[PDB]
Short mmCIF file of C-alpha atoms and ligand atoms in Angstrom, two decimals:
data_model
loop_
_atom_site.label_atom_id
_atom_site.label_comp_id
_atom_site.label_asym_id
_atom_site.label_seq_id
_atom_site.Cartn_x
_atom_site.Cartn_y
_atom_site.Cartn_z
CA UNK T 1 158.75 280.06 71.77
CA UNK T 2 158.19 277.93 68.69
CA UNK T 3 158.69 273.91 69.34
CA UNK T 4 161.11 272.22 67.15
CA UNK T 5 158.48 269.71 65.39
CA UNK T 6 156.95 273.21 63.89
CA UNK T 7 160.70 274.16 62.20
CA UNK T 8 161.92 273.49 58.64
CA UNK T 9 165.29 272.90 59.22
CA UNK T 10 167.64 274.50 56.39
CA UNK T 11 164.94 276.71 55.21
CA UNK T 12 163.19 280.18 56.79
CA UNK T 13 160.08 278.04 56.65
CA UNK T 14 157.59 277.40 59.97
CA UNK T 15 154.10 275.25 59.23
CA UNK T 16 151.19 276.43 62.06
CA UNK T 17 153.09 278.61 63.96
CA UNK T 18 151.50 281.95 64.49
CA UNK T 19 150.94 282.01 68.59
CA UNK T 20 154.67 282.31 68.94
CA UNK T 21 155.39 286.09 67.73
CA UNK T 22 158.15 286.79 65.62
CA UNK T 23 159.78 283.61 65.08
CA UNK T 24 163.59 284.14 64.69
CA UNK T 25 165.05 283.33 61.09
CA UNK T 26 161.33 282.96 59.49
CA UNK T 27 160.95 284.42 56.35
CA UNK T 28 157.25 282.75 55.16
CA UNK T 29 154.96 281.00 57.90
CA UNK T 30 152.75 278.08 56.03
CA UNK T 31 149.27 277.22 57.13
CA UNK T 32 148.07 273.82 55.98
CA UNK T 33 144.15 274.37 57.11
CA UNK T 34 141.80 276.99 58.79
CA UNK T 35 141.27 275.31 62.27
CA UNK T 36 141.60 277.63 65.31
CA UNK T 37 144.81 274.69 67.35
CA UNK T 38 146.71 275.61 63.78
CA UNK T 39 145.52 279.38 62.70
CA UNK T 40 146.11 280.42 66.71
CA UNK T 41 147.81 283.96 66.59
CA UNK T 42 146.93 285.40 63.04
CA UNK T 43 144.73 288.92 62.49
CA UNK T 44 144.65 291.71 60.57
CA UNK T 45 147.90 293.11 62.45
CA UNK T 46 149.74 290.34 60.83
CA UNK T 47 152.70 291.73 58.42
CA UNK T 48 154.76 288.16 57.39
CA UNK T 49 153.73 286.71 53.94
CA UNK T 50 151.50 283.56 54.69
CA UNK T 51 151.40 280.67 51.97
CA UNK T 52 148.60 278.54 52.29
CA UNK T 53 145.67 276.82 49.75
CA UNK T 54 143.26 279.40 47.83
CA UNK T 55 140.09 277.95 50.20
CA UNK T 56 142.26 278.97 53.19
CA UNK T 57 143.15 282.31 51.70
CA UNK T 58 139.53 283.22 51.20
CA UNK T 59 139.18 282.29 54.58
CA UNK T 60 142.10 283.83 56.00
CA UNK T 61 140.98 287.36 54.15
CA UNK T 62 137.18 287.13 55.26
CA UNK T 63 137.18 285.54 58.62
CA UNK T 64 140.62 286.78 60.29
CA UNK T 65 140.34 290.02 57.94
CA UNK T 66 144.27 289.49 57.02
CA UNK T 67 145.02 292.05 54.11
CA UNK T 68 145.12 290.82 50.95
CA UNK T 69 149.28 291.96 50.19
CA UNK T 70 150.27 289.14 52.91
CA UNK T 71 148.50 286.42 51.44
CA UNK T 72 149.84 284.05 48.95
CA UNK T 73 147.23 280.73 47.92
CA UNK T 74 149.27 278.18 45.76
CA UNK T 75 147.49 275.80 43.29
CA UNK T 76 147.42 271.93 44.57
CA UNK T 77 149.99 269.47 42.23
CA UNK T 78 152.02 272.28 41.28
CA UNK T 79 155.81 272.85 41.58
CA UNK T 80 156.21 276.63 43.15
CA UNK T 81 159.49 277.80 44.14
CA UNK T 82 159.16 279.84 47.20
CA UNK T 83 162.30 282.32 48.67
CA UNK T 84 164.51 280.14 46.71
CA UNK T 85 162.79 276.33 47.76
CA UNK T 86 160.97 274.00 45.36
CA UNK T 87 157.65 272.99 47.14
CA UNK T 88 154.15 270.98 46.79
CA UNK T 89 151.00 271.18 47.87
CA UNK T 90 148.93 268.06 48.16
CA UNK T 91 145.31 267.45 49.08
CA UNK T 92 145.37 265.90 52.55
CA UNK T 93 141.72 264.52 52.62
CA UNK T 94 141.08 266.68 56.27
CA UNK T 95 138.38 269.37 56.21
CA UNK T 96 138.04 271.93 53.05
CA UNK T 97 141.44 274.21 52.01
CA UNK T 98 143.47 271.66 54.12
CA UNK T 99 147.02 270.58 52.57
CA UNK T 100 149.87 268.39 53.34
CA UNK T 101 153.49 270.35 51.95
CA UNK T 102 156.14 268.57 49.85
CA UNK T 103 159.95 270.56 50.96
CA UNK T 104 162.78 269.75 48.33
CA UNK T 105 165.31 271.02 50.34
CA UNK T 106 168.58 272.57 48.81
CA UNK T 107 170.82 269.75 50.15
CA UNK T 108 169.00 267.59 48.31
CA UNK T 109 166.39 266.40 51.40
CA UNK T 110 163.01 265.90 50.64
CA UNK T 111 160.38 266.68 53.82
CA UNK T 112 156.83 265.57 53.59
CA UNK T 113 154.56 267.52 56.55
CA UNK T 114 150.79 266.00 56.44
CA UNK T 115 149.33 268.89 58.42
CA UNK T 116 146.06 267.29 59.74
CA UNK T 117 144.92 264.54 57.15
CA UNK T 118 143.44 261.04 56.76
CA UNK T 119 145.36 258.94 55.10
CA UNK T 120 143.66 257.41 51.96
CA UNK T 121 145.07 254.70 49.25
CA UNK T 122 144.67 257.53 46.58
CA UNK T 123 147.54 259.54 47.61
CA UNK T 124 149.95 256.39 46.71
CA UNK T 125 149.13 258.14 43.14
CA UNK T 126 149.60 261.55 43.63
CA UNK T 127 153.03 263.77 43.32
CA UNK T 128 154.49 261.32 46.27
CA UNK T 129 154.93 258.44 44.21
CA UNK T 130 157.76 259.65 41.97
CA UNK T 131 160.39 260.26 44.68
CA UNK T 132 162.08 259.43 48.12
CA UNK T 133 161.20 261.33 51.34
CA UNK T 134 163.36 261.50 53.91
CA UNK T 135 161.31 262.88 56.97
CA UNK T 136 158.04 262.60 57.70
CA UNK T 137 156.11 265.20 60.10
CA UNK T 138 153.13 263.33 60.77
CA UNK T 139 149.52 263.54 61.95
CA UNK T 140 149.30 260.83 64.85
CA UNK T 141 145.95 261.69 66.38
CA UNK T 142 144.82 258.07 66.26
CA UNK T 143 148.19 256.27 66.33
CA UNK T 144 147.04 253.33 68.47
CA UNK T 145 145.08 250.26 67.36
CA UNK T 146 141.58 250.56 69.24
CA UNK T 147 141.15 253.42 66.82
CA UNK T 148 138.82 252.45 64.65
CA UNK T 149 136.00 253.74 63.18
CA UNK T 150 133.96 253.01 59.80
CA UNK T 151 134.42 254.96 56.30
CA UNK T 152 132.73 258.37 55.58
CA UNK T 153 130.84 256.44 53.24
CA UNK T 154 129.47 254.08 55.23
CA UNK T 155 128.83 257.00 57.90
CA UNK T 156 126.55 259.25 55.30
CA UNK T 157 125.08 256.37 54.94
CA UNK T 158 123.29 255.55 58.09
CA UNK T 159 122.75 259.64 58.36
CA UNK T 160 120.86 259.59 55.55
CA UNK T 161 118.96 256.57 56.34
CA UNK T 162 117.78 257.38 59.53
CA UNK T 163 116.90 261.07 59.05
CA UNK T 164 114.68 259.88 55.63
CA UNK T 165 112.99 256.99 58.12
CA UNK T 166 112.18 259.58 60.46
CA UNK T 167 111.06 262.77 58.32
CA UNK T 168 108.96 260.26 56.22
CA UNK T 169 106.83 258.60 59.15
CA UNK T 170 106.45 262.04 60.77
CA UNK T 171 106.68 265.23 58.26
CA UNK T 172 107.13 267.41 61.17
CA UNK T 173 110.28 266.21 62.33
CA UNK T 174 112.64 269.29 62.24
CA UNK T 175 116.63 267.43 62.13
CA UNK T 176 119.40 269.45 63.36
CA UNK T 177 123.41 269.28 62.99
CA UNK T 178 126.16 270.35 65.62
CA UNK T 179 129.11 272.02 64.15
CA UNK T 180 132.02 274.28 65.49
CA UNK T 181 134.47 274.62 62.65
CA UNK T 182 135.05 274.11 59.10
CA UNK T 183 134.47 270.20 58.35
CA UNK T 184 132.59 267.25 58.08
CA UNK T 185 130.02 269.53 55.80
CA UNK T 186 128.72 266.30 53.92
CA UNK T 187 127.01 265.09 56.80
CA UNK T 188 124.27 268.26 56.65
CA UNK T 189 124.77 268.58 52.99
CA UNK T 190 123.80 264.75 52.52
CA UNK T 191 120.91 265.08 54.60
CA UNK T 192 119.30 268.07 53.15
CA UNK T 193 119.84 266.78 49.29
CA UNK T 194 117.40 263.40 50.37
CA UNK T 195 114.91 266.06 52.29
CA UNK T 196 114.91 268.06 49.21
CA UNK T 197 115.65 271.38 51.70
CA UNK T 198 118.09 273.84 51.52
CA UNK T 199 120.24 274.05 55.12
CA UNK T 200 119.27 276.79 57.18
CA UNK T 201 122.20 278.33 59.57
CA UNK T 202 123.59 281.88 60.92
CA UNK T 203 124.67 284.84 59.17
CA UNK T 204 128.47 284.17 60.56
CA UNK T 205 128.44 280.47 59.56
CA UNK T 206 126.64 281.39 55.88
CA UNK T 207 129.80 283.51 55.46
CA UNK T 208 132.52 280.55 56.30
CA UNK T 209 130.62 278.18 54.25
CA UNK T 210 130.91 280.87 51.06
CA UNK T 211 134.49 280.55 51.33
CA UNK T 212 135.01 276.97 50.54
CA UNK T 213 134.07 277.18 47.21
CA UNK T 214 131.57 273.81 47.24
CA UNK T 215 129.68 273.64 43.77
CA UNK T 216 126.54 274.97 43.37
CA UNK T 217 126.55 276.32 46.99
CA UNK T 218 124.17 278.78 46.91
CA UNK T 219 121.81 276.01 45.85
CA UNK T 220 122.07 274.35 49.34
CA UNK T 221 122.51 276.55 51.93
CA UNK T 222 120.62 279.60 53.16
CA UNK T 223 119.98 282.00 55.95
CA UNK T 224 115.95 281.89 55.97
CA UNK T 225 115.22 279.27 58.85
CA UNK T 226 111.80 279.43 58.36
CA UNK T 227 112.42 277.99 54.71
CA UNK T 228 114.74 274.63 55.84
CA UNK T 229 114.08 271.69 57.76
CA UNK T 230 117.41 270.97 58.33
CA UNK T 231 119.09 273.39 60.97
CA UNK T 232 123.11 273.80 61.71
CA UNK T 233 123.74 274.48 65.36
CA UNK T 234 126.40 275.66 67.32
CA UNK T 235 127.96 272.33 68.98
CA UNK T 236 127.39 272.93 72.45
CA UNK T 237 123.75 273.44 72.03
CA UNK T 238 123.02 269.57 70.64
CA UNK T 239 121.78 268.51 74.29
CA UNK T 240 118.22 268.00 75.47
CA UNK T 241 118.35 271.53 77.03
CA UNK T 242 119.59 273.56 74.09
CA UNK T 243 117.18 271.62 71.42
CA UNK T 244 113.90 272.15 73.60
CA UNK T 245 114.75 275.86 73.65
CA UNK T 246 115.61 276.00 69.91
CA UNK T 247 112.30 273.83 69.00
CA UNK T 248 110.11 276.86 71.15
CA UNK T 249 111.52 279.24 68.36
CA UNK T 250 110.36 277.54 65.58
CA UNK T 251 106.76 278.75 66.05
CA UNK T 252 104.60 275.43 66.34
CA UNK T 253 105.93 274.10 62.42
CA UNK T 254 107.41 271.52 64.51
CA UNK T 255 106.62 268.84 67.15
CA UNK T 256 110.24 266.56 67.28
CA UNK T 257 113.66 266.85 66.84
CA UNK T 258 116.44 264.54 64.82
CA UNK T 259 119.65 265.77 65.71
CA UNK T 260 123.23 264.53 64.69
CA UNK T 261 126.45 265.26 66.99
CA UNK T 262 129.44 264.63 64.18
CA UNK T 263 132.04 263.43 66.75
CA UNK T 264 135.70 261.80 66.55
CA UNK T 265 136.38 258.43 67.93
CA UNK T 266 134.58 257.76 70.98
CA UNK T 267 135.11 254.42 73.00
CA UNK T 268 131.63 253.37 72.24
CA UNK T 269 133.35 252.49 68.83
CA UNK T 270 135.08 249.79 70.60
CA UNK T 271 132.17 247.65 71.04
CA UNK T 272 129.03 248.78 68.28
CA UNK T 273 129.36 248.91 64.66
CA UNK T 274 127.77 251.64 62.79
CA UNK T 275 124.41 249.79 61.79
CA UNK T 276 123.91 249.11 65.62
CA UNK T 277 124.42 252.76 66.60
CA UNK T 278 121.31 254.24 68.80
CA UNK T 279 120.36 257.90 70.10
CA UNK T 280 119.93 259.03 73.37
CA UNK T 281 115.71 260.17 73.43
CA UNK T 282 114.01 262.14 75.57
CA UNK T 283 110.93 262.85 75.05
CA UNK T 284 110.26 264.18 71.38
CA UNK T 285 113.89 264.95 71.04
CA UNK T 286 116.69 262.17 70.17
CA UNK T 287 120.42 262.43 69.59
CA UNK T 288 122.80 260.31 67.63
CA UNK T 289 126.32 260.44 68.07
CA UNK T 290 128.17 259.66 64.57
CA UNK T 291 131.17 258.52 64.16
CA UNK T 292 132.44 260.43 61.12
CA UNK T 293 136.29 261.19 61.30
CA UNK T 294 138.60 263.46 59.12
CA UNK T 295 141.89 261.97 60.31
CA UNK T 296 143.55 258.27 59.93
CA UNK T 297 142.60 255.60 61.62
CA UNK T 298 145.53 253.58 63.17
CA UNK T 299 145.41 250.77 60.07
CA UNK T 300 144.96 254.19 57.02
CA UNK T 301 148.27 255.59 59.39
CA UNK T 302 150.15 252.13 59.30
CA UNK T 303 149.24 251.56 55.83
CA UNK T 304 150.41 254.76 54.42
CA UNK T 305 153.68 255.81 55.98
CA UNK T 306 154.71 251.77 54.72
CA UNK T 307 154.08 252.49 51.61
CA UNK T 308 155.78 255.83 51.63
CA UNK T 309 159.49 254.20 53.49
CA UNK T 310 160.34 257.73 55.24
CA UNK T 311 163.85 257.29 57.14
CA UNK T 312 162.74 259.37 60.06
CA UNK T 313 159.45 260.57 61.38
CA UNK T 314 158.45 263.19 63.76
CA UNK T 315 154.97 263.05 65.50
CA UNK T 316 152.97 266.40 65.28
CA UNK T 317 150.04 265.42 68.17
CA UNK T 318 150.19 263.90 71.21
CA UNK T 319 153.94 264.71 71.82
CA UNK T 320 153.24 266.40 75.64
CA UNK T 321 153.85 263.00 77.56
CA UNK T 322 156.63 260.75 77.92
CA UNK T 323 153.97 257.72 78.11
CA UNK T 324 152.01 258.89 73.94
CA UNK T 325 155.74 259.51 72.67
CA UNK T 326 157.22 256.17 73.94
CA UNK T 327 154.36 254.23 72.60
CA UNK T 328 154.07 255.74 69.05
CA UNK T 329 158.03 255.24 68.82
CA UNK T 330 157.10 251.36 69.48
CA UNK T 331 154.63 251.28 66.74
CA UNK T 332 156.95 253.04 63.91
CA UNK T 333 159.56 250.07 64.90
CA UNK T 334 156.52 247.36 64.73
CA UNK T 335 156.01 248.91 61.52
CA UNK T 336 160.02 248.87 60.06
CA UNK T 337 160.47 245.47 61.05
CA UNK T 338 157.10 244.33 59.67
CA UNK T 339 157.71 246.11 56.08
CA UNK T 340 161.50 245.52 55.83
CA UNK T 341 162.51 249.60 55.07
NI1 NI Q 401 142.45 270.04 61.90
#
C-alpha cells in the first residue's frame, strides 16, 4: 500500500508510486526521473496515464516498452492543467529528464515536490520565485552537516586532469568509467572530449544514452570498442578483478588501466579535499573514487528551502527510522529560528 509522503492530498495525483498496484482514488501517477527506487512497478502492462518530462517519456517508451497512448511528456516552465489542476514542471538539476512538480491546488494550496534534485542558487529565478508554497516534499538524502562534498565543476576538473596526465605520459593507457543508471554522464563525456575519443559502451547502454537527447550525441558515443579509449562499464566490474579480465579482451592495444568509480558521499570526504584525492593501484591497474554528487549537500538543502519559507515540509528519504526523522525535524527548526519564517 502506497505511503502517505507519495499522496497529493485534494487531488487524484501520486508522484513515484508504481510498486503499489492500483492505488485507490488515482487518476494520473507522475514520475519525476527514470531511476529504478522511483520507476519500480511500471511495464508494458501498465494502463494509467503517466505524466512525466519528454527525456523520461523516451525512456519510459524504449526501455520499459510502455505504449505510447499512456504516456504524456510536459514541456519544463510551462503552466499545464492536468484533470482539472494547474501544474509546473521545473528542472531539478538530478540526472537527465529529472523534474521537481509545482501543484496549485484548487483550495488555493500551492505544493512544491523536488523529486530527487540538488539544490542550486539558480532555481531562486525560476517559476518559484513569483509565489508562496505551502508544503514542501523534499529530497533529504544528505540532510546532515558532515555532508559535504565539492562542486561538479571542481569534480570534472580533477577527472580531466588526471586522465590527460596519465594518457599523455603513457599512450597506452586504456581509462574506464563505472556506471549503473542514467547520470553523472559528464564525467565520461568530459574525459573523452580532452582524449579526442568517442566513448565506447554496450548495445543496451548505447540505447539509454539515445534517449536523453544530449547535443551532438552521436558525435561522442559509440558501440565499436575497438575504436575508443575510453570504456563505460557496468559498476560492479570497477575492481582489480573485473578490470584485469576486461584489459585480456582488449587484444594487447593496451598495457594499464585508469578507471573512475563516480560515487556519492563517502566518509573519506570528511577528511581529504578533492585535489588530495588518490587511487587504490595494483599493479598496472588504479582506481579513483570521485566524489561527484547529483543531490544537495546539507548547506545547497539549508540554503534553498530558506529562501523558499515553505510552512510545512515532508521528508521523502530516510523516513524508515525514528532516530533520521527526529534529527531532520531538529534541523528544519535550527533552520526557522535561524531565518525568522
Ligand atoms: Ni534519483
Amino acid at each position: 500500500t502506497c505511503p502517505f509522503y507519495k499522496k497529493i492530498p485534494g487531488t487524484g495525483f501520486t508522484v513515484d508510486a508504481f510498486q503499489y498496484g492500483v492505488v485507490e482514488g488515482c487518476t494520473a501517477y507522475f514520475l519525476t526521473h527514470f531511476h529504478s527506487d522511483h520507476y519500480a512497478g511500471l511495464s508494458k502492462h501498465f494502463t494509467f496515464p503517466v505524466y512525466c518530462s519528454e527525456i523520461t517519456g523516451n525512456l519510459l517508451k524504449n526501455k520499459l516498452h510502455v505504449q505510447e497512448q499512456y504516456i504524456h511528456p510536459l514541456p519544463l516552465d510551462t503552466e499545464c492543467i492536468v484533470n482539472g489542476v494547474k501544474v509546473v514542471l521545473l528542472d531539478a538539476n538530478h540526472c537527465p529528464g529529472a523534474v521537481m512538480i509545482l501543484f496549485y491546488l484548487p483550495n488555493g494550496t500551492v505544493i512544491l515536490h523536488t523529486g530527487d534534485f540538488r539544490a542550486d542558487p539558480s532555481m531562486e529565478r525560476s517559476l518559484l520565485a513569483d509565489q508562496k508554497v505551502h508544503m514542501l516534499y523534499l529530497d533529504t538524502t544528505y540532510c546532515s552537516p558532515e555532508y559535504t562534498f565539492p562542486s561538479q565543476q571542481e569534480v570534472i576538473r580533477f577527472a580531466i586532469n588526471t586522465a590527460f596526465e596519465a594518457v599523455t605520459l603513457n599512450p597506452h593507457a586504456l581509462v574506464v568509467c563505472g556506471t549503473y543508471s542514467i547520470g553523472k554522464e559528464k564525467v565520461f563525456l568530459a574525459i573523452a572530449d580532452v582524449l579526442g575519443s568517442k566513448v565506447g559502451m554496450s548495445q543496451e547502454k548505447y540505447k539509454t544514452l539515445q534517449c536523453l537527447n544530449i547535443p551532438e550525441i552521436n558525435s561522442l558515443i559509440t558501440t565499436d570498442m575497438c575504436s575508443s579509449l575510453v570504456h563505460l562499464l557496468p559498476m560492479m566490474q570497477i575492481n582489480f578483478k573485473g578490470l584485469q579480465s576486461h584489459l585480456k579482451k582488449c587484444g594487447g592495444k593496451y598495457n594499464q588501466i585508469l578507471a573512475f568509480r563516480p560515487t556519492g558521499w563517502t566518509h573519506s570526504n570528511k577528511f581529504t579535499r578533492i585535489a588530495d584525492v588518490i587511487p587504490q593501484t595494483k599493479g598496472n591497474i588504479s582506481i579513483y573514487g570521485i566524489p561527484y554528487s547529483e543531490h544537495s549537500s546539507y548547506l545547497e538543502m539549508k540554503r534553498f528551502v530558506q529562501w523558499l519559507k515553505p510552512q510545512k515540509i515532508i521528508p521523502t528519504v530516510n523516513v524508515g527510522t525514528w532516530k533520521s526523522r527526529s534529527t531532520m525535524e531538529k534541523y528544519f527548526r535550527e533552520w526557522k529560528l535561524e531565518a525568522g519564517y
